[PDB]
Amino acid sequence: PLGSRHVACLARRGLGFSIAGGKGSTPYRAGDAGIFVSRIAEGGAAHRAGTLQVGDRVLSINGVDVTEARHDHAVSLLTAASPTIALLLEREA
Amino acid sequence: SRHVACLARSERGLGFSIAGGKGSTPYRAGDAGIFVSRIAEGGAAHRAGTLQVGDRVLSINGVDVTEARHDHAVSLLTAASPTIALLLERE
């Protein structure tokens, strides 16, 4: 029961995906300031996992809300050490 | 109230256990829900520090298990997946 949101739970050699947007960086798309998934590498965990899609809004990383976070700080959470990476994502149909 | 848990399935087997569900004995006298009933300490659930004995398992890998059968929830856990994502209630 997560509503219009969904969870990506990836096993942690590189992320396998990139993000764009947030505070301190250029926006992902004109008219929006939030963090979004901006690329998914082929063969990477994210790609084959099929739970990531470019354009997803990144709401939280490893339980840390980033709807108001800086770009490079959201990227630090992603590169920070843990066996997994949890993403709370919100998608547009 | 609601938490997300993301665990890497370790080759030793994942630590936590569950109890309850529509076709088993409850974990808690008057509740038909699915709860994590034990945590093998050392395992992934314990190392992540995100599971708790007593947590109500709401959903498993996007599948709602608030109304499900004990048999089905274990099936969701048992499935050989690289990860397991849990949505818990409390702790």
Side-chain angles (χ1 to χ4, degrees), chain A residues 1-28 30-93, chain B residues 1-10 12-21 23-91:
Chain A
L2 255 195
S4 59
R5 287 141 190 199
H6 80 271
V7 156
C9 175
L10 328 216
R12 195 76 195 280
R13 193 202 139 194
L15 306 177
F17 69 105
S18 298
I19 62 176
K23 279 148 169 45
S25 172
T26 55
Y28 171 56
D32 211 285
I35 296 152
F36 301 79
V37 179
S38 66
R39 179 177 58 68
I40 294 157
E42 308 298 288
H47 172 226
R48 29 172 183 80
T51 63
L52 297 243
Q53 301 284 247
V54 164
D56 286 348
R57 184 182 299 266
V58 179
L59 267 49
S60 160
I61 314 169
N62 289 329
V64 177
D65 179 359
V66 291
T67 48
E68 288 294 319
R70 282 174 61 72
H71 181 84
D72 57 0
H73 170 241
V75 163
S76 283
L77 302 158
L78 296 173
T79 54
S82 25
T84 67
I85 298 173
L87 280 45
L88 187 56
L89 302 179
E90 190 171 287
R91 186 175 294 180
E92 288 102 21
Chain B
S1 232
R2 277 146 112 252
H3 289 229
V4 161
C6 174
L7 304 171
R9 209 201 198 91
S10 91
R12 292 272 176 183
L14 238 160
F16 71 98
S17 285
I18 55 158
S24 161
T25 44
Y27 168 85
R28 168 190 301 172
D31 203 89
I34 302 174
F35 300 74
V36 0
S37 51
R38 186 169 178 159
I39 297 201
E41 288 202 30
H46 190 239
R47 281 178 276 185
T50 299
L51 312 242
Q52 294 254 291
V53 171
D55 287 353
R56 193 197 292 286
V57 182
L58 259 18
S59 178
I60 306 180
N61 288 0
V63 183
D64 189 339
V65 292
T66 54
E67 86 315 336
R69 293 163 198 179
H70 175 87
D71 183 22
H72 295 356
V74 177
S75 149
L76 289 164
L77 303 191
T78 270
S81 45
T83 58
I84 176 63
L86 295 171
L87 218 188
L88 279 342
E89 222 172 25
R90 275 195 73 238
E91 300 343 74

